[PDB]
Structure 1
Amino acid sequence: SHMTVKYTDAQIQRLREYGNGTYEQKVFEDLASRDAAFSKEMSVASTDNEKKIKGMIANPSRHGLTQLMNDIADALVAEGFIEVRTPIFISKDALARMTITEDKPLFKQVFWIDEKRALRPMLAPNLYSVMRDLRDHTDGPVKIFEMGSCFRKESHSGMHLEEFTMLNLVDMGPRGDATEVLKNYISVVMKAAGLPDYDLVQEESDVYKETIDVEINGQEVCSAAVGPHYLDAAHDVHEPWSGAGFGLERLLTIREKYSTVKKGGASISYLNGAKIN
């Protein structure tokens, strides 16, 4: 049959712990060749991992996630966006205003702090407030963005990451062609993240006026949309707007070719793609 045997599922997990190669593409003739190559790639993975750690101690740099955030934010500031920073705590009434109530499945993913406050699962509740407040101070476009941790329970959503860093940009204000405005903003982020080549998926929407999803090799990377949305009235928003949400850990993982999504972000086991324990 020829080129039949791949790495086993257990072999893949062992290789990915310290290594960042693409081991799921290797094919082999028989079990002996697989085990021989597995032994060699495990040794290379562990040795390459040790070299990278010593390279960081010898020549430290900014954290890869913090570097990713600075590169995108500077590009968005240069595009006229205001960087805002909102608290991680949001109120139960803010969640309810987002239709985040019970028997709605997202409610079970929410980390509750007390009876009245919770960890934000998304940046939309606070961004809604800042959008409306800035409309009172200008009649031109309201262009804001925030990068910050969001929290969702793993055992109700998958997602693999309970804490994840989101980037959400918003351009509130009527546009002659909000789609081109959206695609230009996505291009600004994707080039600044170091991922200039990607795929766009444009579909008409039920709740929004138009959605735009960004793909890289079939992987979901960004979900954008053109307003209005049926939740705009609940937040005293009554004008067109376009926005885009980016998972920054997911962007960093794809750019740096990390084998899992838990290596580039916040961790006590990993540091910039290398396992320190």
Structure 2
Amino acid sequence: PALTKSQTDRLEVLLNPKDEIGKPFRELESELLSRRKKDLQQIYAEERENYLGKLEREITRFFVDRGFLEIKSPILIPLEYIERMGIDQIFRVDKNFCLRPMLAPNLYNYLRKLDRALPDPIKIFEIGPCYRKEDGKEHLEEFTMLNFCQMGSGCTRENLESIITDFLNHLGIDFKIVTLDVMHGDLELSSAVVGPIPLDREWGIDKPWIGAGFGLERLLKVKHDFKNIKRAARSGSYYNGISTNL
């Protein structure tokens, strides 16, 4: 015969990058299902930790060990911050609030405020959900952002390039630095910047600083060689990359 679209996409979903796997569709599907169920049975028997959660924790350990303060800010923020971010893809909620499309606005308020109680340099970071009406191969609507930044005198690209390297070296991911765009192949892993920037004026930040934002789903995409980033995202359709529609 020849697989119909519906059957190819179906095999696609049940397929795993590590799969060793002609044969008719029903046999291919039956065998792949059997494997996926076993893969799930293994995770349940040995691991049990969710990829998204586990990586978040590992990333948190790294930064917390390197002197960064772990921030947990609101996901539902005032629409003002979006304006204040010089934004003239957003999920609006109610009257003047929305779902944070980035971690920057809330981190800015922490840099400013903390800058009055903590000695330079101020090192903070946050890992969490961000939303953007979106190319499900690199982009999701609900993704997880890692944002870190250090504020104080002397902060430079060098400093920045240092953390990014120790970081990705730690995670165990290849990369290529090329504002900076931490690339892995041609997949953008992160967007980093060396302060100060005009926008700093909009939030009361008057010291130089360095920061980078990474998408944990892309880190996972690369770490587990997923074709579709959705396999790394929050969903009820995949668990640690294993289809749940079995």
TM-score, normalization: structure 1? 0.78
Instruction: Map 1:72-221 onto structure 2 (within 5 A).
Output: 72-101=59-88, 109-154=89-134, 160-175=139-154, 178-195=156-173, 197-201=174-178, 211-221=179-189
Contact 1:151 1:162 in 2 (8 A): yes
SS of equivalent to 2:163: helix
Shifted more, 13-22 versus 85-94: the winner is 13-22
Q: CA deviation at 1:12?
A: 6.1
Q: Is 2:207 the partner of 1:261?
A: no
1:57-101, CA deviations, whole angstroms, 9 ceiling, x for partnerless residues?
Answer: 323421111110111111111111110110011112222111123
* Equivalent residue number for residue 26 of structure 1: none
SS of equivalent to 2:111: helix
SS of equivalent to 1:80: coil
TM-score, normalization: structure 2? 0.87
1:188-234, CA deviations, whole angstroms, 9 ceiling, x for partnerless residues?
Answer: 33133331x21111xxxxxxxxx111111211111111011111001
RMSD: 2.6
The alpha-carbon distance between structure 1 residues 234 and 158, as it changes in their structure 2 partners (threshold 3 A), is: farther
Contact 1:146 1:167 in 2 (8 A): yes
* Equivalent residue number for residue 243 of structure 2: 275
Alpha-carbon separation, structure 2, partners of 1:90 and 1:264: 25
Contact 2:137 2:227 in 1 (8 A): no
Number of residue equivalences: 240
Alpha-carbon separation, structure 2, partners of 1:171 and 1:38: 57
Contact 2:145 2:214 in 1 (8 A): yes
Query: Gaps spanning 5+ residues in structure 2: where?
Result: none
Contact 1:16 1:259 in 2 (8 A): no
Shifted more, 131-140 versus 119-128: the winner is 131-140
Shifted more, 82-91 versus 146-155: the winner is 146-155
Alpha-carbon separation, structure 1, partners of 2:133 and 2:98: 12
Query: Gaps spanning 5+ residues in structure 1: where?
Result: 1-6, 24-35, 102-108, 202-210
Contact 2:152 2:208 in 1 (8 A): yes
Contact 1:72 1:192 in 2 (8 A): no
Instruction: Map 1:28-43 onto structure 2 (within 5 A).
Output: 36=22
**What is the letter of the counterpart of residue 79 of structure 1?**
R
Identical residues among aligned pairs (%) = 39
* Equivalent residue number for residue 212 of structure 2: 244
**What is the letter of the counterpart of residue 199 of structure 1?**
K
SS of equivalent to 2:63: helix
Alpha-carbon separation, structure 1, partners of 2:123 and 2:52: 23
Alpha-carbon separation, structure 1, partners of 2:67 and 2:24: 51
Contact 2:137 2:228 in 1 (8 A): no
Alpha-carbon separation, structure 2, partners of 1:199 and 1:230: 27
1:86-132, CA deviations, whole angstroms, 9 ceiling, x for partnerless residues?
Answer: 0011112222111123xxxxxxx111111111110000110010000
Alpha-carbon separation, structure 2, partners of 1:38 and 1:192: 44
Alpha-carbon separation, structure 2, partners of 1:19 and 1:77: 37
Alpha-carbon separation, structure 2, partners of 1:217 and 1:41: 32
